[PDB]
Symmetry: C3
Subunit: 260 residues, 3 copies
């Protein structure tokens, strides 16, 4: 089974994260499937929009696969590390992207949403960046995108406390576009895609590029955030505390941090 599925619904490509038994956590196989489907969407002029969703009724994406992290397995597209987490977060394409958040969207899952142009969410879905609670950071763009997409103070609380945010509160803040009845997020996301795909495709695509400040394929304003994220990650990996998140979980206990 591939880590993600891709199918066409008219002029929309639907990409589905396909690891429901692992709460659709992202590993390399997910990145290969999502990444390859996004690139097929970019080069097919018949595709006018993309929807990203998770298999089943429980999870959009629970985050980075923590068992893969403990096993020192790379999470990204083996052929395209430049596409970032899930082959998705640093993978600009011209076509509009919509996250159809069907359930739990925590950590990496919320970062998939931030990376998408638009978000529709099941009313039961929960958002958040709990990475800091287990000695990680939101390295898949979360750390510099959350304050671009939420008011500064609201973004900082979320980032520094790691506490979750309901779909309703996300929508109230303008972090997501709409909250829908349980079970209906895919149809709602296709209806949003149609409200876009009827428009002149070159116009929509020029609009997207200008709105993100894209020059020759690259979101140039994001580069300092990625560079700082990489720089920080390297110091964190060396720390004693870097051992403690996994160690605490393994020993069925609360972590005791040393700030070293």
């Amino acid at each position: 089974a591939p880590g993600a599925l891709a199918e066409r619904r008219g002029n929309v490509m639907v990409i589905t994260i396909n690891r429901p038994e692992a709460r659709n956590a992202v590993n390399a196989a997910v990145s290969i499937g999502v990444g390859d489907a996004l690139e097929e969407a970019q080069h097919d002029p018949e595709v006018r929009a993309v929807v990203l969703t998770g298999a089943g009724d429980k999870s959009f994406c629970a985050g980075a696969d923590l068992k893969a992290i403990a096993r020192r397995e790379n999470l990204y597209h083996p052929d395209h590390p430049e596409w970032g987490f899930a082959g998705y977060v640093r993978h600009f394409i011209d076509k509009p992207t919509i996250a159809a958040v069907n359930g739990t969207a925590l950590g990496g899952g919320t970062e998939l949403a931030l990376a998408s142009d638009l978000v529709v969410a099941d009313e039961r879905a929960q958002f958040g960046l709990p990475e800091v609670k287990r000695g990680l950071i939101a390295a898949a763009g979360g750390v510099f995108r959350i304050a671009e997409q939420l008011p500064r103070k609201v973004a900082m609380r979320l980032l520094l406390t790691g506490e979750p945010l309901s779909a309703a509160a996300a929508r109230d803040w303008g972090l997501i576009n709409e909250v829908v009845e349980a079970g209906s997020v895919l149809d709602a996301a296709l209806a949003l895609a149609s409200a876009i795909t009827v428009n002149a495709p070159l116009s929509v695509q020029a609009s997207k590029r200008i709105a993100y400040g894209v020059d020759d394929g690259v979101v140039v304003g994001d580069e300092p955030g990625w560079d700082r994220t990489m720089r920080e990650m390297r110091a964190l990996l060396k720390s004693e505390d870097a051992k403690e998140g996994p160690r605490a979980f393994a020993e069925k206990r609360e972590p005791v941090w040393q700030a070293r």
Copy 2:
């Protein structure tokens, strides 16, 4: 007939777009009227604020004049292309600007609100950026300003779908400052102006310059947005879709 009228109410200059039969659509005449007025406002120390509004009871500004566009007419101020659309959107002045939106404010009209410092709207007013439905884009600043002034996701849905936004919803998001009773927008805008003109003018003007990041009359942070809008728009006018979009009337896009 002049494309825009300018007059004084005390220490406020009121600029009125004056093509109500064309729903206050912007052409070169409007850009000349609005632009000359702003420059006069900039250089008269007695003018402490400016209010922009549209003639009549139905339209603030319907957008770029589509018949002018179809005839390949230049829409801007002939002597000041660098001021941009309506001689307004890239024409920074030190005096505070308030859009008094008396009605329809679509495309170019929403771009005039974005470019203004404050917005007070008639409850009937509609905002939106429908350029993408017509094979064009919001080239007068809208494509990069809308995501600066609304939450990213909200701005993005407005930009990509082209669908309108009510005045009430615009206020709820903080895109405009107030929504007022039908017919009252000009008086509301003047009352707001006086809450500003009572203050020390050099103070108000310095705060405006710091808040927008102005060095030598240029909003430094907007220049990449303009550069990208210009290069994208060049290619886009060469496409068939950019001709197919107007002249309808349900268009057929070939993505070319």
Copy 3:
């Protein structure tokens, strides 16, 4: 007595401006105590967060001590107002706004990561009413932290926002009832200090674009603020402002 106090509550440093009789107005002694405490917070691995608050229950901070003499940290003028507003530290900061916060206190709130406020508190930048501007970061930060149009009204009118309205816009995190603002800030502090401190601290640095203890994106804001203040400080209007308040009369501005 010292201008501000610093005390530990577990892994939180509480910094209290210690001048209740003066409404906690900032002078040099305050800047010394606040600045020194932040620096102790920065270098002590046990301090995982910082709460800033005012002594007593009437005032968070009244602003610059109107009986002004330097007000900054004599050894660290680069930290700016109260040794606080241009003094990045790795540890998250929570303003516990326990009373009035017009002007300077709003600038301390803008500088902090998080804000908990008394429902009585008001947030505003009334400096434009007296001939000067919010020079302790307020002008450029208010537009970063409120929606553009809402920030511009606040800045140009000099009128206050209620704590509740500030919370509705996302400018502050929490509004509580008088007497328990510090309790509510410590509860917020604990929701952060429970987490891995190096991850929290790295997240803060990235979120603000920090390279070697400097918020690089703020520097043009500081530079423009100082440039503008230099012209404001010589103007006849900046004399007319306090001269008028003093004499119980309306000021007459010349825009010079």
